[PDB]
């Protein structure tokens with residue numbers, strides 16, 4: 001198994017609005033590739 | 048503590064579409080009352 | 095596999111994940127469907143569409159919902175029409191008000207309705223409510239005339255906890271209503 | 276208190292709880308953001324707005340997301356532009372394409388962007404990517420220029436497992452990507 005980990009402090013309250021939408025993006029240019037997602041889980045708790 | 052329980056067989060697949068919305072409704076007529084909900088939790092699992 | 099869960103223990107004035115119809119609105123940490131006013135209707139829908147069954151596999155979802163509600167009427171002899179928990183198509187709009195509870199339009203079986211509702215009926219409508227004239231909890235399938243009802247004694251202003259469960263292996267829909275006292 | 280949770284282990288051809296933008300579509304159990312075609316963009320959003328912080332209490336949500344993705348390119352020296360997981364305002368629409376990943380419009384900090392993205396950048400844009408020209412994972416806040424990056428060796432066609440967690444107590448966003456071999 002090979003893994004990579006990165007961490008950063010991000011003050012969410014100051015960057016995003018109270019309600020948001022979460023999602024995925026992908027683009028290609030003159031060089032390209034296919035980008036697929038096979039599965040997705042998500043859990044949030046406010047309060 | 049007073050409780051009430053009702054059971055019935057309902058063949059969901061034959062009455063509602065594959066995708067649905069869940070919610071609450073309330074009405075008043077010549078006679079009325081206030082209707083309100085204080086908390087709401089839901090869990091479903093397909094397959 | 096596909097699952098979905100949510101829990102709201104207190105409503106925001108700007109509850110973005112809900113769709114409001116009629117007089118429904120959020121106030122003081124609570125969801126108000128109707129205020130104590132005549133001839134009105136209010137509905138609130140969770141905005142995510144839920145995947146209930148899969149045409150492809152024939153699978154049907156297992157699900158459970160829990161909620162706390164209150165009915166506050168002027169008196170035990172002046173209360174109408176009732177409140178429901180319902181499952182309907184994604185573009186559902188309020189239907190006939192009054193004794194139809196904002197969800198059905200007839201006591202006759204309307205296959206185009208595609209709605210299942212669990213009602214807490216506080217007013218007796220002679221045309222389709224149980225003969226005994228008692229308030230009751232009922233399971234509604236495409237029609238305002240319940241397929242099964244259970245007599246229930248309304249406790250005015252009191253908080254009732256309700257649990258509604260559907261067991262897909264069985265097709266059984268169970269409803270439990272409880273009062274502290 | 277509010278909680279939200281969802282799991283999708285296989286995508287339906289009619290995934291009504293997702294919003295698709297650009298070429299995003301579902302097919303064969305999978306969500307395709309882009310095909311291996313030149314100059315294109317695709318996005319897929321979960322449709323329910325998520326309540327991330329509260330005005331009132333000043334509370335901030337703890338959250339965790341996990342997903343499996345694959346990037347399939349013609350070869351190791353022909354791959355662009357990349358993929359991201361992002362958090363944006365509810366009304367978000369695709370922004371600039373190519374090196375901007377469909378989520379940003381500039382390498383300068385843009386407060387009005389209000390978008391945080393975790394990128395998996397496969398193509399070196401000289402105007403703002405790390406000087407080493409290596410492919411990398413990065414944390415982006417209102418800009419295409421990451422605040423922090425980590426070199427990453429793309430395994431062409433391999434399924435990567437990613438976990439992205441946010442700890443409201445420390446404001447620390449953590450990203451972990453794992454490959455089987």
Ligand SMILES: [Ca+2]
Pocket residue numbers: 175176193215216217218219223
């Ligand atoms: Ca009635």
Ligand SMILES: [Ca+2]
Pocket residue numbers: 356357374396397398399400404
């Ligand atoms: Ca790049």
Ligand SMILES: [Mn+2]
Pocket residue numbers: 213215222223224232238240
């Ligand atoms: Mn009835």
Ligand SMILES: [Mn+2]
Pocket residue numbers: 394396403404405413419421
């Ligand atoms: Mn980059």
